[PDB]
Write an enzyme that holds these catalytic residues in place. Structure first.
Site, PDB file in Angstrom:
ATOM      1  N   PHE A  33     -41.459 -57.356 -22.700  1.00 23.53           N
ATOM      2  CA  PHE A  33     -41.661 -56.136 -21.947  1.00 23.53           C
ATOM      3  C   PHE A  33     -41.510 -55.007 -22.954  1.00 23.53           C
ATOM      4  O   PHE A  33     -40.450 -54.872 -23.571  1.00 23.53           O
ATOM      5  CB  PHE A  33     -40.639 -56.062 -20.811  1.00 23.53           C
ATOM      6  CG  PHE A  33     -40.826 -54.906 -19.867  1.00 23.53           C
ATOM      7  CD1 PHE A  33     -40.311 -53.653 -20.169  1.00 23.53           C
ATOM      8  CD2 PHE A  33     -41.464 -55.086 -18.652  1.00 23.53           C
ATOM      9  CE1 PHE A  33     -40.459 -52.601 -19.302  1.00 23.53           C
ATOM     10  CE2 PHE A  33     -41.615 -54.030 -17.771  1.00 23.53           C
ATOM     11  CZ  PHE A  33     -41.113 -52.786 -18.100  1.00 23.53           C
ATOM     12  N   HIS A  70     -36.736 -58.861 -23.507  1.00 18.12           N
ATOM     13  CA  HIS A  70     -37.068 -60.113 -22.853  1.00 18.12           C
ATOM     14  C   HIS A  70     -37.849 -59.834 -21.574  1.00 18.12           C
ATOM     15  O   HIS A  70     -37.488 -58.959 -20.785  1.00 18.12           O
ATOM     16  CB  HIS A  70     -35.796 -60.897 -22.545  1.00 18.12           C
ATOM     17  CG  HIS A  70     -36.036 -62.137 -21.745  1.00 18.12           C
ATOM     18  ND1 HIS A  70     -36.834 -63.170 -22.191  1.00 18.12           N
ATOM     19  CD2 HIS A  70     -35.587 -62.510 -20.521  1.00 18.12           C
ATOM     20  CE1 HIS A  70     -36.867 -64.124 -21.276  1.00 18.12           C
ATOM     21  NE2 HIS A  70     -36.117 -63.750 -20.254  1.00 18.12           N
ATOM     22  N   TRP A  71     -38.963 -60.537 -21.401  1.00 20.65           N
ATOM     23  CA  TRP A  71     -39.731 -60.420 -20.172  1.00 20.65           C
ATOM     24  C   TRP A  71     -39.137 -61.393 -19.170  1.00 20.65           C
ATOM     25  O   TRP A  71     -39.215 -62.609 -19.355  1.00 20.65           O
ATOM     26  CB  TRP A  71     -41.212 -60.701 -20.400  1.00 20.65           C
ATOM     27  CG  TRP A  71     -41.979 -60.676 -19.113  1.00 20.65           C
ATOM     28  CD1 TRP A  71     -42.021 -61.654 -18.156  1.00 20.65           C
ATOM     29  CD2 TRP A  71     -42.799 -59.608 -18.628  1.00 20.65           C
ATOM     30  NE1 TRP A  71     -42.823 -61.259 -17.112  1.00 20.65           N
ATOM     31  CE2 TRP A  71     -43.312 -60.007 -17.377  1.00 20.65           C
ATOM     32  CE3 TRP A  71     -43.159 -58.358 -19.135  1.00 20.65           C
ATOM     33  CZ2 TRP A  71     -44.153 -59.197 -16.626  1.00 20.65           C
ATOM     34  CZ3 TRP A  71     -43.998 -57.554 -18.381  1.00 20.65           C
ATOM     35  CH2 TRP A  71     -44.483 -57.976 -17.144  1.00 20.65           C
ATOM     36  N   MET A  72     -38.543 -60.861 -18.116  1.00 20.77           N
ATOM     37  CA  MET A  72     -37.846 -61.691 -17.159  1.00 20.77           C
ATOM     38  C   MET A  72     -38.829 -62.397 -16.222  1.00 20.77           C
ATOM     39  O   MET A  72     -39.842 -61.834 -15.809  1.00 20.77           O
ATOM     40  CB  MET A  72     -36.839 -60.847 -16.362  1.00 20.77           C
ATOM     41  CG  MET A  72     -37.323 -60.320 -14.993  1.00 20.77           C
ATOM     42  SD  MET A  72     -36.164 -60.999 -13.555  1.00 20.77           S
ATOM     43  CE  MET A  72     -34.832 -61.409 -14.809  1.00 20.77           C
ATOM     44  N   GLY A  74     -38.967 -64.024 -12.583  1.00 23.40           N
ATOM     45  CA  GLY A  74     -38.306 -64.143 -11.306  1.00 23.40           C
ATOM     46  C   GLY A  74     -38.987 -63.296 -10.263  1.00 23.40           C
ATOM     47  O   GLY A  74     -40.217 -63.187 -10.247  1.00 23.40           O
ATOM     48  N   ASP A 154     -31.800 -44.557  -6.985  1.00 24.09           N
ATOM     49  CA  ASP A 154     -32.923 -45.052  -6.194  1.00 24.09           C
ATOM     50  C   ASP A 154     -32.692 -46.552  -6.006  1.00 24.09           C
ATOM     51  O   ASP A 154     -33.426 -47.433  -6.461  1.00 24.09           O
ATOM     52  CB  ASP A 154     -34.276 -44.766  -6.844  1.00 24.09           C
ATOM     53  CG  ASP A 154     -35.428 -45.179  -5.946  1.00 24.09           C
ATOM     54  OD1 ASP A 154     -35.169 -45.368  -4.734  1.00 24.09           O
ATOM     55  OD2 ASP A 154     -36.569 -45.338  -6.455  1.00 24.09           O
TER      56      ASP A 154
END
Ligand SMILES: Nc1ncnc2c1ncn2[C@@H]1O[C@H](COP(=O)(O)OP(=O)(O)NP(=O)(O)O)[C@@H](O)[C@H]1O
EC number: 2.7.1.15
Length: 254
Positions: A33, A70-72, A74, A154
């Site tokens: 990311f 790191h591209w998660m 989930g 938010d």
């Protein structure tokens, strides 16, 4: 057609936009990311485990800060998920992190006081709105709190990520303010947790459901709802639906 994205690295990586300046990047089984000009805040979010952890950083010749995370893998959390212990514990970790507080201050952030905030409510306003701003002025006396902390602001469920690795994350940190914890705890409990469970939720969080909390919470959720309808006056679709959500909110607080 060329894609304006040649500031990079390696030609053997797929790159395409994915909020903000978000691009994904793929090569073999490694997804990243990437973000252009992220805040120095991000380093502390990663070290504290709030967001998927940093992988590298590169300072461009112009001075752009490019960061890889790191591209998660989930899913977002569903509203049903917001009452779990892990959600309450992560929010408690944000609200007690002195290292996150220290960065926001170093970046020149105002402690956010309900005084100056109620003044910013400049709206232009139906009759229900007028009675709303009444409740906020006639309770400002009781919405005080000295220990301001980092608030995300938010805390909608779609900003919570859950990994296949059983990691929970909270993302999108542009509205991060120094403020009363209630400014987050209110909207969360009011929107996703049935009030017979509030005290047990706050016990996982680690806070007793005191009487200044009940008032502080109700003040900011009402304040939030009114400042959201305000926004749709510049649109005319979700403006007529927020009013119905405010009508119910009004009934619960006398
Ligand atoms: N480091 C990160 N920071 C912010 N958002 C992230 C990060 N890593 C992943 N995401 C988000 O998480 C989602 C990607 O997770 P992923 O499981 O690949 O997507 P998916 O739609 O649920 N499954 P798939 O359709 O097969 O890609 C997107 O919403 C991404 O923007």
């Amino acid at each position: 057609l060329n894609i304006d994205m040649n500031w990079l690295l390696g030609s053997d990586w797929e790159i395409f936009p994915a909020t903000g300046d978000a691009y994904y990047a793929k090569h073999n089984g490694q997804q990243l990311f990437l973000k252009r000009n992220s805040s120095p805040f991000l380093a502390v979010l990663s070290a504290e485990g709030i967001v998927p952890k940093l992988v590298w950083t590169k300072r461009m010749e112009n001075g752009d800060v490019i960061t890889a995370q790191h591209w998660m893998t989930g899913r977002e959390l569903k509203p049903k998920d917001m009452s779990g212990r892990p959600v309450a514990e992560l929010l408690r970790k944000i609200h007690t992190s002195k290292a996150l507080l220290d960065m926001l201050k170093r970046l020149g952030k105002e402690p956010l006081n309900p005084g100056a905030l109620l003044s910013q409510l400049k709206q232009q306003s139906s009759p229900l709105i007028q009675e709303g701003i009444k409740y906020l002025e006639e309770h400002l006396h009781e919405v005080h709190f000295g220990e301001k902390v980092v608030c995300h602001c938010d805390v909608n469920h779609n900003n919570w990520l859950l990994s296949e690795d059983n990691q929970l994350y909270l993302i999108d940190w542009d509205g991060a303010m120094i403020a009363d914890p209630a400014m987050d705890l209110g909207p969360l409990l009011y929107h996703y947790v049935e009030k017979p469970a509030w005290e047990s939720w706050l016990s996982m969080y680690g806070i007793e459901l005191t009487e200044s909390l009940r008032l502080r919470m109700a003040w900011y959720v009402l304040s939030e709802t009114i400042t959201f309808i305000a926004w749709h006056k510049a649109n005319d679709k979700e403006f007529h639906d927020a009013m119905e959500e405010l009508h119910i909110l009004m009934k619960r607080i006398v």
